[PDB]
Amino acid sequence: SLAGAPKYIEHFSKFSPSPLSMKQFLDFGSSNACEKTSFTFLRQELPVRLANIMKEINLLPDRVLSTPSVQLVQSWYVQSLLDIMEFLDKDPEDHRTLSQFTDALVTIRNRHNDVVPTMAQGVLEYKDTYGDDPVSNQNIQYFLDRFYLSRISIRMLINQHTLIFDPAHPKHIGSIDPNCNVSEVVKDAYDMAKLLCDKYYMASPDLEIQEINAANSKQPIHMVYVPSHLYHMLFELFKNAMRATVESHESSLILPPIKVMVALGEEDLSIKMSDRGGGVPLRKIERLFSYMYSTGYGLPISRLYAKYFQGDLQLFSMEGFGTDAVIYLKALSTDSVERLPVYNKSAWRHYQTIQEAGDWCVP
Amino acid sequence: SLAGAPKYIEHFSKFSPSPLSMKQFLDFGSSNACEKTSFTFLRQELPVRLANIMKEINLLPDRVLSTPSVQLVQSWYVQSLLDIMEFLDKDPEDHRTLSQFTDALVTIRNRHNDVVPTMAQGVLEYKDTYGDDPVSNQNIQYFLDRFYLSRISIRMLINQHTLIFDPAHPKHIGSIDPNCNVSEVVKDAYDMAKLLCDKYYMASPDLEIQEINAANSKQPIHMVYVPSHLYHMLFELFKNAMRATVESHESSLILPPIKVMVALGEEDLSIKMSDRGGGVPLRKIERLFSYMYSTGYGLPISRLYAKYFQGDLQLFSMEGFGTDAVIYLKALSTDSVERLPVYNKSAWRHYQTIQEAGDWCVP
Ligand SMILES: O=C(c1ccc(O)cc1O)N1Cc2ccccc2C1
Ligand SMILES: O=C(c1ccc(O)cc1O)N1Cc2ccccc2C1
C-alpha cells in the first residue's frame, strides 16, 4: 500500500533539512496543539533527514556499500522511512494518529539502537574483504562524520517528541536542561570514569575544577544544553586522560591530577581538560579521530556531539608531558543551532575523488 | 641570448622540487668540491622551484592576477629565473662561474626582499578594485600558503649557499645551528617583544620557562634548527600574548606572566606559550590565519615556518581566560624534511572550484 522506497527517497531528498536552535527546541510546549504541530513537523522533517543521508550512503565506494553490515543499516533506514510514510495521509486531529505516531518513533529508535557498531562492522568488512585504500578511506571518513551527525540529529528530534509527549527532571524540556550546571556534569563524568579506572588500575588521578565566569566572577556557570551529550563527551575525555596518566606513571604512587577549567565568555562556554599523561606525538593526533585506525569511536563521535550545536572538540598534546582537550560550546541558546549535513551538489562533488600524487612533495 | 621565459617555465615546471632534510643541509661542506656540487645542484633546483610556483600563480583568479602588485612579483620571479638560465652552459670548474653565481643569488635575494608586503598589496588591490568574493578568497588563501612556503624554501637554499660559500657563529652551518638551545631563543624573542610592549604600554608580563626533557630530565633542551625561523615564530607569538595580556588588564598593576613550556619527546619538540589575556571566541580563530582578514601576516607566515620542516603552529583559546599557542617541531634532524608545494594535477584541481551552496545546512 506504500510506494517503493526509492520513490520516497528521491522525493524527500530534494528538500534541505531544517536546523532548529536550542532556543526553538526549548520554546516548544506540551499541549495537544503542540503535539499536533510536532506531528505535522516531524512527518515531513524526519523523512527529509532520512532521505538526505540515505542518498549519500549510495555515494560510498561499491566496496563499502557491498558489505552486509552497511546493507543492513540501509535496510533499517528504508523501513524507518516507510514507517513514517504510513502517516502521510493521517489526520492530526485524531488522537489515535498521535499515539500511533509516538509508538512508531519509539520503534524506529529501537530499530536503530545498534547503528554505530553495525557501521563499524561494515568498515571492518570492507577492510577484510578488499583491503583498505586511501581514497576509499577518505570517503569513509567524510561520510561517517556526516552519517553519524545526521543520526544524532534524528535521535534528538525523536527523543524530544517522545519525552515531551510521553520523570526524574520535570524542569527539563525533553532531553534539554535549561539550567545545566556544567561543573556538576563534569563531576558526574569524572565519577563514572574513576570507577572504571579504579577497577583496572586500582588508582586514578584526582579531579580539580576551576571556573572562570568572565562577566560574573562569583556566579556558578550554567547553560542551556542536553546534559547527556555533555556527559558523553566528558566521560570519553576522562577515560583517555585517566588511562594516559596511570599508564605513564607505572612506577608512581603519586598521580598528577586531571585539571578541568570551565570558562564562560561572551560567545563561548569552553571546557578544558588537562592531564600530565605523557602525551602523544603530533603525527598520531589525526588518527585519534579516524574511524579507520579506530576500527573505539569514542573521540570522533564525541567531537560530533560538540559540533552538533555549533561547537567543537579539539586535542592538543605535548609529547613527553601530557594532553589538553577542549570542548567548545556556544554560550547562548540562540547561537546553538543544529549543524546538519545536506545532500547537494557540494556534498556529491566531495565524494568524486580519485588516486593521484598530492599537491605536496615527498622526497 | 636567452629563450623567452615561458619556454623555461614550462620546461622546469615538469620537475618536482627535491626536498632536503635538515640532516642533509647540515652534512654539506665548504670546499670547492662542495661549492661546485652546490652550484650544479642549485642551477637545476632553483629553476625547478621557481617554475613550479610561477605556474601556480597563473591559476589565480583573473581578478587577482590582473593587479599591478601581483604582476610586479611575477616579473621578479621571471627575471630571477632568467638570471639563473645564464648559468646553464657555464663550467663549474671555472672559479669565476662560482663567484658570479653567488653574486647572482645575492641579487635575486635582494630583488625579492619585499615580496611578502608586495603580494599583500596585490590582495588589497583585488579587494579594492573588484570587491572580494568567497571563491576567490579561498583560492587566495590556498595559493598564498603555498607561495609563501615556496619562498621560504628558496630563501633557505640561497642563504645556505651564500653563507657557506661567502661571522658571529662559526659553529653554524650556513643558517643552521646544530646545537640550538631552545630556551635561549625563547628568551631572545621575549626580550625583543618586551621592548615593544614596554614602549607602548609602559608594562609587560614577566616570562616563566619550564623545560620537560622526557628522556633526560636534567639535560637542557637543544635541537638542530634555523634559529632565525624559531625566533620569528616566538616573537610573533609573544607580541600577541603580551598585547592580549595588557589590553585585558587595563585596570591592573599586576599582570599575569606568560608561561612557556619546552617539551622534548621521542618525536616532537613542542613549545607552548600560555597567557591569561582574556582569549578569543572560537569563531574568530580561523581569521587569525587568514590573509584576507589580516589585509599583519605574522601568524600565518609563522605557521608556515613551523610547517616548513614538518612541524606546525596551533592556537587554542578559552574566551574569558586566555590563549595557548603551540609550536610543534620535529625533534630529530632526520625527520626535519622540507615541506614543498608541487605543481601537479592535484594542485591544479584544488583551484578548480566555483560558487554554490555548501554541504552543510543553514537555517
Ligand atoms: O595523550 C593522550 C590523550 C589522548 C586523548 C585525550 O583525550 C587525553 C590524553 O591524555 N594519551 C596518551 C596515552 C598513553 C597510554 C594510554 C592512553 C593514552 C592517551
Ligand atoms: O587571545 C589572544 C591571542 C591570539 C593569538 C596569540 O598568539 C595569543 C593570544 O593571547 N588575543 C586576544 C587579544 C586582545 C587584545 C589584543 C590582542 C589579543 C590577542
Curated annotation (Swiss-Prot), chains A, B:
Enzyme class comes to transferase
Location of the protein in the cell? Mitochondrion matrix
For whether the record's keyword set contains Transcription, the answer is: no
Q: Entry's Gene3D superfamilies? A: Alpha-ketoacid/pyruvate dehydrogenase kinase, N-terminal domain, Histidine kinase-like ATPase, C-terminal domain
User: What tissues express this gene product?
Assistant: Expressed in many tissues, with the highest level in heart and skeletal muscle, intermediate levels in brain, kidney, pancreas and liver, and low levels in placenta and lung.
The family note in this entry says: Belongs to the PDK/BCKDK protein kinase family.
Q: What is this protein called?
A: [Pyruvate dehydrogenase (acetyl-transferring)] kinase isozyme 2, mitochondrial
